[PDB]
């Protein structure tokens, strides 16, 4: 499983305070414990190495929200879990988070940030999918615009994905979550 040991080595790297700096394909091999030639005879570049890391977010988040919907039906509940889903996936994978936030994407080709924008584009419309289904479920819709409703929340999450980064994983996102919640809940007015 050599195409899962490198990835693991890399993911850990973004967590180390060497995450702020450009990860070279040299010091990558060193940590893995191989040659640079034992890296490239697999992946055609770094882009694929990071693309294979982008995926694990798309999968362990998109498909994971969709799973909530099937199972969880209540809106205020759904609109909470999705939020926890975000802030939760972060603190548990801070390596992957610098990728999510974009910082650790400043070094790789720009196609990757665009593919991260997409991730956000989907989960936002998915948030908008939960907002729509309040009328059909509870005879009544939100007074605020759904397009701007969800976006407003997703705003709150990136700004909790950023503060986790800035401080080097001391400003945890999942801290005081029973507390922060009624505030954005009070937004859902």
């Amino acid at each position: 499983n050599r195409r899962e040991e490198i990835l693991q080595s890399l993911a850990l790297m973004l967590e180390s305070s060497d995450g702020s700096q450009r990860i070279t394909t040299a010091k990558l091999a060193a940590s893995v414990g191989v040659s640079e030639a034992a890296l490239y005879r697999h992946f055609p570049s770094k882009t694929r190495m990071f693309d294979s890391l982008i995926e694990f977010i798309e999968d362990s988040l998109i498909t994971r929200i969709n799973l909530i919907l099937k199972d969880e039906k209540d809106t205020t509940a759904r609109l909470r879990l999705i939020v926890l889903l975000l802030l939760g996936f972060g603190e548990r994978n801070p390596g992957l988070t610098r990728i999510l936030t974009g910082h650790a994407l400043m070094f790789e080709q720009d196609r990757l940030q665009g593919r991260i924008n997409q991730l956000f584009e989907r989960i936002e419309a998915q948030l908008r999918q939960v907002m729509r289904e309040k009328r059909m479920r509870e005879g009544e819709g939100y007074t605020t615009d759904e397009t701007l409703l969800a976006s407003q929340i997703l705003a709150f999450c990136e700004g909790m994905l950023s503060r986790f980064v800035r401080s080097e994983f001391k400003y945890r996102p999942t801290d005081d979550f029973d507390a922060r919640w009624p505030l954005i809940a009070a937004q859902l007015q």
Binding site: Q8, F56, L67, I68, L84, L85, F89, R92, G95
Partner: peptide, 8 residues
Amino acid sequence: LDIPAFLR
């Protein structure tokens, strides 16, 4: 829910 991790 349970939130998954890369650090297997």
